[PDB]
């Protein structure tokens, strides 16, 4: 495995590197350096190639360089479209090939967005089965960090409880859910639920009731 | 060219496993033929390349073994095959064109999910308007995908399936919410279709208020 850093940052304008140190049995013994850019969902797509050479269909703000067992890729001019994960790739000895281990690049300028939710009651073809689920669906929202607690007529709800990892959206926003199973017992029991989600220090509350 | 993959695959560890790779669009025997292994939130793995001409292959070290790369020049075919999966093995699975020192062109990728756990087949409920939001929720299903259309995929527009969550069951749930104007809720029908193929479950729900 190739040993490139976790993660790496930079704002829109500027110009950012990701390293890539090998051995000499792929990086220093051959001139075969190539470097792969995939987004979420999709295949990975050749950014550099032999190094220093780019392909017809990449911007020329990607350049590559090789300094003994180390490569490295240069991004110029950041855009927003440039978050991805980067992984750099070496022919190694006996017709072999490595991979690195990954480089997400996080473009450091999106403007806080605050979340929207809506609250979805346990439906009758639900109940009927003797099963009761409330939904929270979390949208827009950025940075991608939420906290999610429920109340039963105010009172701090422990159990039923399961929360998804926040996960970004095709608007560079994330989303998130949040699903409290009940039993029908306790859903006509008290006379209200809330969702109630906090994002930068700010709750947002919904509530649904029988 | 195109390197089609075939469809995804729901395994049990132990079960045999092969997994095929098309090529088409160009002279087969004459650019590598290379698997690339990228597990759920991981990195990408090489695994082994093959020369269609000879079929001469060279493999990752931790993969050799457990793995076998073939082809068939007769039908442009590159095959990877398991005597035995592992529950290790679950990841997603790319053939790819390797000519020289670079990989040009990907197949789509194959989803392999190796889980002693049983398919089983999603409930769908209707999550009712009451702009209007309505939506549907897929629950207790395994494996993971479902994919969800509104209106037999009529209904593109205001469409968010939001991610799904793995709850302590085993089972994953999942909410598809499609935003749509408070006024055609009366005089527009809106349909989910639910299609979870692991489990070969097809389903279809009305949201009605």
């Known amino acids: 495995v190739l040993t490139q850093p976790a993660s790496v940052s930079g704002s829109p304008g500027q110009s950012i590197t990701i390293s890539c140190t090998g051995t000499?049995?792929?990086?220093?013994?051959?001139?075969?350096v190539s470097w792969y850019q995939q987004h979420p969902g999709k295949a990975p797509k050749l950014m550099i190639y032999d190094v220093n050479n780019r392909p017809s269909e990449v911007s020329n703000r990607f350049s590559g360089s090789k300094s003994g067992n180390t490569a490295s890729l240069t991004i110029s001019g950041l855009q927003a479209e440039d978050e991805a994960d980067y992984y750099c790739s070496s022919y190694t000895t006996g017709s072999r090939a490595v991979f690195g281990g990954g480089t997400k690049l996080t473009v450091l300028g999106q403007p806080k967005a605050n979340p929207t939710v809506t609250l979805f009651p346990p439906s009758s073809e639900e109940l009927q089965a003797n099963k009761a689920t409330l939904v929270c669906l979390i949208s827009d929202f950025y940075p991608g960090a939420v906290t999610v607690a429920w109340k039963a007529d105010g009172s701090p709800v422990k159990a039923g409880v399961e929360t998804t990892k926040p996960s970004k959206q095709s608007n560079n926003k994330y989303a998130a859910s949040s699903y409290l199973s009940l039993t029908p017992e306790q859903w006509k029991s008290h006379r209200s639920y809330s969702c109630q989600v906090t994002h930068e220090g700010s709750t947002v509350e919904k509530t649904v009731a029988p | 060219v195109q390197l089609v993959q075939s469809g995804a695959e729901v395994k049990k560890p132990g079960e045999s496993l092969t997994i095929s790779c098309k090529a088409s669009?160009?002279?087969?025997?004459?650019?590598?033929i290379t698997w690339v292994r990228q597990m759920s939130g991981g990195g990408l793995e090489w695994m082994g390349r093959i020369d269609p001409g000879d079929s001469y292959t060279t493999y990752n070290p931790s993969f050799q073994g457990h793995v076998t790369i073939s082809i068939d020049k007769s039908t442009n075919t590159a095959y990877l095959h398991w005597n035995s999966l592992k529950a290790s093995d679950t990841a997603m699975y790319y053939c790819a064109r390797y000519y020289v020192s670079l990989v040009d062109i990907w197949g789509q990728g194959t989803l392999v999910t190796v889980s002693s756990a049983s398919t089983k087949g999603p409930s769908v409920f209707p999550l009712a308007p009451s702009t209007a939001a309505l939506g549907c929720l897929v629950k207790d299903y395994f494996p993971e995908p479902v994919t969800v259309s509104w209106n037999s995929g009529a209904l593109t527009s205001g469409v968010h399936t939001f991610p799904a969550v793995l709850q302590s069951s085993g089972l994953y749930s999942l909410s598809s919410v499609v935003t749509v104007p408070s006024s055609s809720l009366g005089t527009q029908t809106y349909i989910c279709n639910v299609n979870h193929k692991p489990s070969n479950t097809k389903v279809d729900k009305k949201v009605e208020p």
């Open positions: 000499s049995s792929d990086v220093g013994g051959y001139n075969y």
């Open positions: 669009g160009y002279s087969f025997p004459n650019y590598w």
